[PDB]
């Protein structure tokens, strides 16, 4: 059965595929082709030529069917796609066909499509195919960035696996504040949200990546306001606390270095150098990266010392 029905499935695939290609060469663009392909695509959704066949069939049937008959076909196609996605949610071919289909409908139900994306994202919050599809739906339905920002918040807060959510915020925030580099009040609120995340789970690498971005998204250090200066100093002390609790946590060590750079490179030169030594011991696979970073910082410190009157 295992190594017997193996050959059963293969022969069925071989034979159905066989028939699809004969029908195609014959110009028989009909429901029989949809039946045959449904059989194959559920198991192998990356067989792009068969998705192409289904499109050719649907296109042809549209011309020769009543609007109501065409409507029925479309609904059956949505259901087929949803069944395929359940089995293989990370197939480029399936998600593409859904997009092709929705883009051509008279009256697409975009709110239902956004809900499909929410369901899939509950099951796999990192499924980039579904996140791209959501962005497509959002654009088509002209959903405003502020509502998408509300969505990301709930996702970041209800559980982890957040890299895809933070990524999406990095794209939405500049749209609420669009400029030909975030406003300081927005940045301060983002720093607060991310500090929350990484203290809530210091192993959450997604929050550290996003925080490094935040730390570059703003002022310049001789341009630090008293509020930002104060907030960055607070973060620095909070990272030192964490380092005490989690002395194998490399993300927090790296972040201490980056905060000191953000605050005053020359004043913290001695501590920055100490921290590189600690960090290399804790994250030996990154020693070459860390040495190049330290070299870059030391060179920047030279340029700063030379700027002195």
């Amino acid at each position: 059965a295992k190594r017997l029905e193996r050959e059963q499935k293969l022969k069925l695939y071989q034979s159905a595929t066989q028939a699809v290609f004969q029908k195609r060469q014959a110009g028989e663009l009909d429901e029989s082709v949809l039946e045959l392909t449904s059989q194959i695509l559920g198991a192998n959704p990356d067989f792009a030529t068969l998705w192409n066949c289904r499109r050719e069939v649907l296109q042809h049937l549209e011309t020769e069917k009543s609007p109501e008959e065409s409507a029925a076909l479309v609904k059956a196609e949505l259901g087929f796609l949803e069944s395929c996605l359940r089995v293989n949610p990370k197939s480029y071919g399936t998600w593409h066909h859904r997009c092709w289909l929705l883009s051509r409908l008279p009256e697409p139900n975009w709110a239902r499509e956004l809900e499909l994306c929410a369901r899939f994202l509950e099951a796999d919050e990192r499924n980039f195919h579904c996140w791209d599809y959501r962005r497509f739906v959002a654009a088509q339905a002209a959903v405003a960035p502020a509502e998408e920002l509300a969505f990301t918040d709930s996702l970041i807060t209800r559980n982890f696996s957040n890299y895809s959510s933070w990524h999406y915020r990095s794209c939405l925030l500049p749209q609420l504040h669009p400029q030909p580099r975030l406003p300081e009040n927005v940045l301060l609120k983002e720093l607060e949200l991310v500090q929350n995340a990484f203290f809530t789970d210091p192993n959450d690498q997604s929050a550290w990546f996003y925080h490094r971005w935040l730390l570059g998204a703003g002022s310049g250090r001789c341009e630090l306001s008293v509020e930002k200066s104060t907030v960055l100093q607070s973060e620095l002390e909070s990272c030192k606390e964490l380092q005490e609790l989690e002395p194998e946590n490399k993300w927090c060590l790296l972040t201490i270095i980056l905060l000191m750079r953000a605050l005053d490179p020359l004043l913290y030169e001695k501590e920055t150098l100490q921290y590189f030594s600690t960090l290399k011991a804790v994250d030996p696979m990154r020693a070459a990266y860390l040495d190049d970073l330290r070299s870059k910082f030391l060179l920047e410190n030279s340029v700063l010392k030379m700027e002195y009157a």
């Binding site: 193996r6 990524h167 999406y168």
Partner: protein, 322 residues
């Protein structure tokens, strides 16, 4: 945290004779199930053989006839006879032909017209006439054209503008504008920017950091945060790092040990992870990763084209890297 643990008895030496045997015998189930990618399968097999100095054990004349039979009237090349043309398989076909110094086996002017036709107003490329847009296809287009000496056939500045619009907060690149960074897309976009002479637009320190952080304690690389390692990232991640002049930012010995551990000592071949079933796809990217890391029994490999450098030297197509 998500990682593999390598068993103390994992392979730890390179089994070149077993891998060449494995490929030379391949396709003599998942093989019939994979006819839909056959042209790329052939490219994987042939290229890994050539990196191992064993290309002559494959059937050149048979492959040339097959390739000619997969070129459609539009100029594009399909995965197999009777399948539909796509940029993915058009690249694989041109890569194969370049390995064999046999480009004129197909109609080059029609390939060029096919590639040109798939570029969109924003500079992006669709995979085929059905309109899927992915930076994978921007790479397929420019790599195909570069190998043919016809990069000037497309709108190169607009193509650059589109790829650059796909650059993210973390220095990486996704499928389309707004898409999350992923190693596969980073390879495609850095390869594109190598080909088009735009590597100065990459933030090499930031992206290089993101890439080196793919290396897990096992020594293997994942394709994005919080995923499991897979030996094919020895290609996607390492080639990108090499393009951007930061290959030394990963632990080469640890990664080498991980790659060797993915070999099947009885069948030959490499699997995605140690102890898994092998395939020709992971066999290529395992061996090519080792070549990047400097393994003396393997020919040097182009980080842009994933073909032996000696082949690219022959056609004079060797993009400058960082």
């Amino acid at each position: 945290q998500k990682d593999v643990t390598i068993k103390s008895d994992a392979p730890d030496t390179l089994l070149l004779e077993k891998h060449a045997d494995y490929i030379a015998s391949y396709g003599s189930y998942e093989y019939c199930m994979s006819e839909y990618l056959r042209m790329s399968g052939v490219y994987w097999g042939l290229t890994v053989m050539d990196l191992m100095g064993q290309l002559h054990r494959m059937n050149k004349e048979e492959i040339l006839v097959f390739i000619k039979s997969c070129q459609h009237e539009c100029g594009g090349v399909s995965a197999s006879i009777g399948h539909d043309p796509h940029l993915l398989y058009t690249l694989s076909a041109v890569q194969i032909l370049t390995l064999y110094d046999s480009i004129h086996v197909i109609n080059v002017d029609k390939v060029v017209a096919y590639v040109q036709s798939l570029q969109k107003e924003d500079g992006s490329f669709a995979g085929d006439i059905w309109g899927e847009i992915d930076t994978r296809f921007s790479f397929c287009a420019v790599a195909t054209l570069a190998l043919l000496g016809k990069l000037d056939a497309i709108n190169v500045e607009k193509a650059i503008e589109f790829v650059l619009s796909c650059m993210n907060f973390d220095g990486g690149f996704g499928c389309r504008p707004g898409s999350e960074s992923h190693a596969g897309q980073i390879y495609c976009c850095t390869g594109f920017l190598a080909i088009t002479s735009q590597l100065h637009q990459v933030n090499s320190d930031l992206l290089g950091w993101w890439l080196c952080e793919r290396q897990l304690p096992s020594g293997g690389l994942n394709g994005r945060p919080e995923k499991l390692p897979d030996v094919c990232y020895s290609w996607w991640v390492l080639a990108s790092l090499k393009i951007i002049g930061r290959l030394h930012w990963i632990d080469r010995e640890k990664l080498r040990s991980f790659i060797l551990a993915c070999q099947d000592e009885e069948t030959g071949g490499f699997a995605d992870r140690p102890g898994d079933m092998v395939d020709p796809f992971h066999t290529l990217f395992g061996i090519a990763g080792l070549s990047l890391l400097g393994e003396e029994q393997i020919k040097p490999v182009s980080p842009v084209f994933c073909m032996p450098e000696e082949v690219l030297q022959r056609v004079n197509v060797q993009p400058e890297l960082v």
